[PDB]
Amino acid sequence: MMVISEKVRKALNDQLNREIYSSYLYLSMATYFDAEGFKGFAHWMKKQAQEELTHAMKFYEYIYERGGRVELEAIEKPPSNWNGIKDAFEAALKHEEFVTQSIYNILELASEEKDHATVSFLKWFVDEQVEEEDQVREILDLLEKANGQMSVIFQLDRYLGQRE
Amino acid sequence: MMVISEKVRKALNDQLNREIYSSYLYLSMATYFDAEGFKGFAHWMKKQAQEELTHAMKFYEYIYERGGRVELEAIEKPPSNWNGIKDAFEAALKHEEFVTQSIYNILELASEEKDHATVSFLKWFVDEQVEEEDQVREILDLLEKANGQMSVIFQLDRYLGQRE
Amino acid sequence: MMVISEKVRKALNDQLNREIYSSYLYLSMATYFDAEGFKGFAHWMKKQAQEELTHAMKFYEYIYERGGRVELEAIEKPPSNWNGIKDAFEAALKHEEFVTQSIYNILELASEEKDHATVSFLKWFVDEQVEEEDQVREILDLLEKANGQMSVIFQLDRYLGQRE
Amino acid sequence: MMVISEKVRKALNDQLNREIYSSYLYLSMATYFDAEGFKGFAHWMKKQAQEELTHAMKFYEYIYERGGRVELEAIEKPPSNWNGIKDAFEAALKHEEFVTQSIYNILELASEEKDHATVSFLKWFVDEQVEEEDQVREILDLLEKANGQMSVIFQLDRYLGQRE
Amino acid sequence: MMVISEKVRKALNDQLNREIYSSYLYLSMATYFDAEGFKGFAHWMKKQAQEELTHAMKFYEYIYERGGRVELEAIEKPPSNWNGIKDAFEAALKHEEFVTQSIYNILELASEEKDHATVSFLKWFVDEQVEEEDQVREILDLLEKANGQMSVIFQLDRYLGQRE
Amino acid sequence: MMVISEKVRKALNDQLNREIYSSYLYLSMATYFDAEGFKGFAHWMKKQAQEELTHAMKFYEYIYERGGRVELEAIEKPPSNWNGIKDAFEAALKHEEFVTQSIYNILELASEEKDHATVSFLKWFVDEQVEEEDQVREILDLLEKANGQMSVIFQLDRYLGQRE
Ligand SMILES: [Fe+3]
Ligand SMILES: [Fe+3]
Ligand SMILES: [Fe+3]
Ligand SMILES: [Fe+3]
Ligand SMILES: [Fe+3]
Ligand SMILES: [Fe+3]
């Protein structure tokens, strides 16, 4: 039997599908960067795409642990182009902030229903989001300082390309 | 410059998107097996999904290697209910044979264009598809013999759950 | 001096005595499985009883850490017979869900008094209960599928008898 | 089929229930010592409680080896306060002497019925009780010599707190 | 941009400054124990001072992770004398209990604002405060028993002198 | 009995308090660097803060060795903002030169009193100050040759961020 409410299960399943899209978005960002000749930034992006899939799978497994099931939905076509390296990371930041609020919304729902199990489950993602958001801010800081000097982009492309 | 034709690039890009769908389909099968309580079968499908992403990425990197660009498209909602275990693996077989034929179509397009580089590149996938098809046929034969007997199905689930 | 309220101390002390009873219940189930000749299912229950004792001792030590004292109460006689293996596990699931509600009630009490220390301490048990319920549900679902088939029950007894 | 008589089975099951009570009593002594701030003496009592459970389980397994079954009974509420350290260890000594006589009584019953298997089984307990009683008498001797001197009691608490 | 509200940033920054003062208060207790010839108690306080700096640095880094900034404020002159060993440790407990309440107030502010990230972040401190308080209470219990007997105070000085 | 003069004790205690302020000043410089997004310069400043505390503790311990006592004083609020990276390191150099003269004044005081123990003790700090001043001058040299070029400033930030 399912021990989560249908509302909570729906919220969790919706969030699973959002992490799938997050993954796919970051893959397309990789497509952009590769097309611009920045293999390091693209490498970063491929690595992030994989990280998002681990988030999806954490939701996946918790749904089953509470006796629900997952239903996968259509994935929307992401953007494939950005107006420059900074434009893409600003998009990444705004996406991650949106994911954080989505998670927050599930937390508040669960808390309202006195579903302490789901509330506790979500702590991990609250904490991870802090780091996801921070990593993109740091990159934007470094890009802001670089002011388009290939010299610096070459080392910072190199640097993000050493990820993992 | 791009040194594949736009027709070939499009064919390869379409197949990249097909492999992403394959990955998602196998994940959907995993959602089914997990809902039905077969974690071994679900495990096998999760590994298979991961494998399909590696195929997608081989297409990805070849496209850039020949000067082209990748454009990610919408992914269709996969089916989530099968009549039973054997029906889900039968659908997997059918899907792999469809992918094989998709690959054959690119290969024939490339040989027509004398794009020997792309022809040589696809050989890996022709060979890999033979193995992919064979693995599912083997499971199907076991499941035909089990003839719905739970005791045998349980053994198969445990064995497929050992997939590395 | 005691830094928890007497209301929260009593709630914690009550839960400690409930975890002792849990332990005893599982030992009782081991008596039943051993009477029926299922040494592997009995082993599992013995290990489960020991696990419940570690939960009791976690409450014990937290009560003292907040300046309170533990008072052990009488332990009720558990049932000692069930209507087969599946019935025993059904009872075990109902007991665990009852334990989860008991933890929830303490959590809600402590929250209402702003006893953040106790709220935080109780997170571990919320998370543990998710796993405990899930382990029983997994066993039940296997048993549902087995439909009393002795070959499947033998293999399950062997597997549960491996529990560390 | 049960090879022990119902009378010997009842005596063995009674004694298993008595050993469970012994465990619970020593845990209660630990609650007292922890309340008084003697964590070493409390640790000694927790280890003793664990030891008593091993005794219960030795009775358990022999009952099943002879084709009988265990029925767990309610556990009486133990005392939770003593007049001082000596008072608590004196209560432990008295309890152990009572357990020794309880085992003697089973031995005498088994011997009257010519149940040589059960007589032989009980030798381990006769021997173990010698050591159990001696251990408490040793501690009492040292407490008698300490005569309320805290330098000496600190050392004793520390030592008993190293019990493996 | 700063993710945290200015009210929450202020609260966290004020606490960082409180933890710096805690550090310095414990160094001051070391200066007292060193003046009294208790190098072990002084060692303990030097270790506790170092621990409080790790706390401050945890706030520090969280503030920057949320896009805020730290401002270091003047540090008040701590007391430099106590009326005896117990007196100093009683002052340490009162201080720690004040620190716990300060933390609780941040947590309640953050919860009111639905700043789930900061609420989550503070759990570590709620748990750590339980242990900080407990360790000083334990010391105070021992000192109470020692009751000014120098042979027992020597024992405790050597013990606390072994803090790593 | 104290075998340093009260004048020398007071000068040494003043200097211990000056080293504490040095520590705090470097932590404040770290707050600025972190606010400006230079985590490597911020790391170096944190490590510098820690080193200054080791200096304070060397004064601390010598004072106790000569039979004196340490009295901790209020610590002034440090500046938190500079006009750029070079401005901060110039302010660090100026501070260290001031600390050097502070040490020199104690040395001269101790010499006038024929306190050869204290003169000798202070030689360590004379030599260390030569090295602390050189450390900062080297960095200021590297910042001058960077000449505002971000490529180079990033190599220096990462490098100073390796400090152990
Ligand atoms: Fe994510
Ligand atoms: Fe494929
Ligand atoms: Fe439990
Ligand atoms: Fe015993
Ligand atoms: Fe602290
Ligand atoms: Fe210094």
Per-position DSSP letters for D1-70, written without gaps between them? ---S-HHHHHHHHHHHHHHHHHHHHHHHHHHHHHHTT-HHHHHHHHHHHHHHHHHHHHHHHHHHHTT---
C1 interfaces chain D, CB cutoff of 8 Å? no
DSSP letter for each residue of F58-85: HHHHHHHHTT-------BPPPP---SSH
Are the C-beta atoms of residues A23 and A139 closer than 8 Å to each other?
A: no
Question: What does this entry list as its resolution, in Å?
Answer: 2.0
B16 contacts: CB under 8 Å, gap ≥ 6 = B56, B59, B60, B63, B70
Check the annotation: does D113 bind a ligand: no
Which chains have at least 3 CB atom pairs separated by less than 8 Å from chain F? A, E
Distance of alpha carbon C162 from alpha carbon D9, whole angstroms: 29
Q: Report phi then psi at D75, rounded to 5.
A: -105, 120
E112 interfaces chain A, CB cutoff of 8 Å? no
Distance of alpha carbon F105 from alpha carbon D11, whole angstroms: 89
DSSP letter for each residue of B128-161: HHHHHHHHHHHHHHHHHHHTT-HHHHHHHHHHHT
Q: Report CA-CA distances (Å) from B84 to B41, B44, B94.
A: 12, 16, 16
Q: D112 C-alpha to center of ligand 4: Å?
A: 24
Distance of alpha carbon E162 from alpha carbon B55, whole angstroms: 59
A158 interfaces chain B, CB cutoff of 8 Å? no
Are the C-beta atoms of residues E68 and E14 closer than 8 Å to each other?
A: no
SS3 E75: strand
Q: What is the CB-side half-sphere exposure of residue D153 using CA atoms within 13 A?
A: 19
Residue numbers in A near F150 (CB within 8 A): 145-147, 149, 151-152
Q: What is the CB-side half-sphere exposure of residue F25 using CA atoms within 13 A?
A: 19
DSSP letter for each residue of F111-126: HHTT-HHHHHHHHHHH
Distance of alpha carbon D96 from alpha carbon D116, whole angstroms: 25
Sign of the Cα torsion A37, A38, A44, A48 reads negative
Sign of the Cα torsion A58, A63, A67, A72 reads negative
Are the C-beta atoms of residues B136 and B89 closer than 8 Å to each other?
A: yes
Residue numbers in C near D76 (CB within 8 A): 74
Check the annotation: does D6 bind a ligand: no
Helix F39-65 vs helix F6-35: angle between axes, to the nearest 10 degrees? 170
Please count the residues of chain B: 164
The residue whose two tokens read 């309610």 is D74
E149 interfaces chain D, CB cutoff of 8 Å? yes
- Two tokens, residue E117: 């990230």
Beta-ladder partners of D75: C75
E147 interfaces chain D, CB cutoff of 8 Å? yes
In 3D, which of C124, C96, C102 has the Cα closest to residue C16?
C102
Residue numbers in F near E24 (CB within 8 A): 20, 72, 75
Please give the torsion angle defined by the CA atoms of residues D94, D96, D99 and D104, in that order, rounded to the nearest 10 degrees.
-100
- Two tokens, residue C160: 């549960």
Sign of the Cα torsion D48, D51, D57, D58 reads negative
Please work out, in degrees rounded to the nearest 5, the angle formed at the alpha carbon of residue C118 by the alpha carbons of C116 and C124. Answer: 110
- Two tokens, residue A66: 């509470």
CB atoms within 10 A of CB A145: 16
Distance of alpha carbon E75 from alpha carbon F24, whole angstroms: 10
| Distance in angstroms between the alpha carbons of the first and the last residue of chain A | 40
Check the annotation: does C83 bind a ligand: no
CA D51 to chain centre: 8
DSSP structure class, residue A75: B
Of D34, D69, D74, Cβ closest to residue C74: D74
Distance of alpha carbon B153 from alpha carbon B88, whole angstroms: 14
CA C21 to chain centre: 8
The residue whose two tokens read 């982009």 is A153
Are the C-beta atoms of residues C123 and B127 closer than 8 Å to each other?
A: no
Q: What is the CB-side half-sphere exposure of residue F72 using CA atoms within 13 A?
A: 28
- Two tokens, residue A6: 């249908």
| Strand runs labelled E in chain E | none
Method: X-ray
Are the C-beta atoms of residues A80 and A31 closer than 8 Å to each other?
A: yes
Are the C-beta atoms of residues D118 and D63 closer than 8 Å to each other?
A: no
Are the C-beta atoms of residues A142 and A86 closer than 8 Å to each other?
A: no
Distance of alpha carbon D70 from alpha carbon C33, whole angstroms: 11
Are the C-beta atoms of residues B144 and B86 closer than 8 Å to each other?
A: yes
Are the C-beta atoms of residues A125 and A55 closer than 8 Å to each other?
A: yes
Please work out, in degrees rounded to the nearest 5, the angle formed at the alpha carbon of residue C48 by the alpha carbons of D78 and A116. Answer: 95
SS3 C70: coil
Are the C-beta atoms of residues A71 and A13 closer than 8 Å to each other?
A: yes
SS3 B2: coil
The residue whose two tokens read 């997997």 is B92
Distance of alpha carbon A93 from alpha carbon A88, whole angstroms: 9
Number of H helices, E strands in chain E: 5, 0
Please count the residues of chain E: 164
Q: Report CA-CA distances (Å) from F101 to F61, F108, F134, F137.
A: 22, 10, 15, 17
Are the C-beta atoms of residues F25 and F146 closer than 8 Å to each other?
A: no
Distance of alpha carbon F19 from alpha carbon E27, whole angstroms: 14
Distance of alpha carbon F164 from alpha carbon F157, whole angstroms: 14
H or E stretch covering C12: helix C6-35
Are the C-beta atoms of residues C12 and C106 closer than 8 Å to each other?
A: yes
Check the annotation: does A51 bind a ligand: yes
Are the C-beta atoms of residues A11 and A104 closer than 8 Å to each other?
A: no
Distance of alpha carbon D53 from alpha carbon C23, whole angstroms: 12
CB atoms within 10 A of CB D144: 9
- Domains, chain E, ranges and CATH? 1-164 (1.20.1260.10)
H or E stretch covering D158: helix D150-160
Can you give the C-alpha Rg of chain A in angstroms? 18
Cβ-count burial of D75 within 10 angstroms (0-12 exposed, 13-18 middle, 19+ buried)? buried
Please give the torsion angle defined by the CA atoms of residues E152, E158, E159 and E163, in that order, rounded to the nearest 10 degrees.
150
CA E140 to chain centre: 16
The residue whose two tokens read 């039940």 is C140
Distance of alpha carbon C76 from alpha carbon C127, whole angstroms: 27
Q: Please list the helix, strand and coil fractions of chain A in percent, rounded to the nearest 5, in that order.
A: 80, 0, 20
